[model samples]
Target: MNRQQFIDYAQKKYDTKPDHPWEKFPDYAVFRHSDNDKWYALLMDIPAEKIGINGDKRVDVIDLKVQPELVGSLRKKPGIYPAYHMNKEHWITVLLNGPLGAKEIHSLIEDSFQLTR
Candidate 1:
């Protein structure tokens, strides 16, 4: 799920749109629940090496809120890391190219949406 792909998926699934909450990083996207206004997912670009990939190539990643139990189990897997910028528990960063398929990415976003909602 590249950034725009994720954005579109969220829009279709939730009838929601993304917001670039930070002026300094205008491309960073936040997907949130309209009712509560709490972020469910965040999309951003960072160097691949920042997430333990071999090169400095830029990569798109999604930071999603997860249950802490699921968070611990999911981290350290391929293409997943601790939340890139969000340091709280129950949060995770997943690479768009993590080999995460359409359904895989879809369910994960559902988890984030339900949890944050």
Candidate 2:
């Protein structure tokens, strides 16, 4: 899914809204739990090459917290990578350009939501 679509889905499913906390990087958004304000998801535009893709193209990605044990196997899957600019051991970066479906992405997001709580 695209950025806006993902944002809408997240809002509808999790009752969480996107927050642009980084003034310098306006396109980056963070989604946090209302109860404790802990981040569950982070969306940003990053160079495809950063995640081992062939071209130096820009791609939208969402970083979600995950169980450390699952990180290795999840990264082995297509369109997933170590969390960009976050703790790699406990988080993962999922490409928003469609290798993974909405349901799977939402599942990960929900896992992240519970994890950070």
Candidate 3:
């Protein structure tokens, strides 16, 4: 799914919405927490080549907080990889033009939310 699609899902599911913490990337921060005030998930649009994809075009991806053990195997899945800009051990970047369905993505979203808390 794309950024807006996930934003809508978040809004409906958790009454949460994306927040622009910086002007540089308004759509980056996905879930700013209610308690500790930490960011849980992130949606980013980045150059495909930056993530080792063989393309000059930009691709949409989401950063999900995940267990370290799962990160290793998750990277082997289609369209899933180490984070573009976060600590890879605890986070993963999932391509939005996905090989992963919403079911898996939704599970990741919940995982991220729970992991942060």
Instruction: Choose the strongest candidate by lDDT.
Output: 2
Answer with 1 or 2, whichever has the higher lDDT.
Answer: 2
**Residue-wise C-alpha lDDT for candidate 2, range 27-92, written one tens digit per residue:** 999999889899999999988888877676899999999999999999988878888999999999
Worst 10 residues of 1 by lDDT: 97-106
**Model 3 misplaced regions, further than 4 Å:** none
Put down candidate 3 lDDT per residue, 11-61, tens digits, no spaces: 888788677777988656768678887777888888889888886798889
When sorted by TM-score, best at the front, the candidate numbers are 2, 3, 1
C-alpha lDDT (0 to 100) for residue 113 of candidate 3 = 87
Q: Is candidate 2 or candidate 3 better by lDDT?
A: 2
CA lDDT, every prediction?
Answer: 0.84, 0.90, 0.85
For model 1, state the Cα shift of residue 70 in Å. Answer: 1.2
RMSD value for candidate 1? 1.4
Show model 2 residue runs off by greater than 4 Å: none
Predicted candidate 1 versus true structure: per-residue lDDT over 1-117, tens digit per residue: 577677888899999988998999987889888798999988998888877777758988999888988887788566678888896577898899667676877888899999988
Ten contiguous residues minimizing lDDT sum, candidate 3: 25-34
Q: Per lDDT, what order, best first?
A: 2, 3, 1
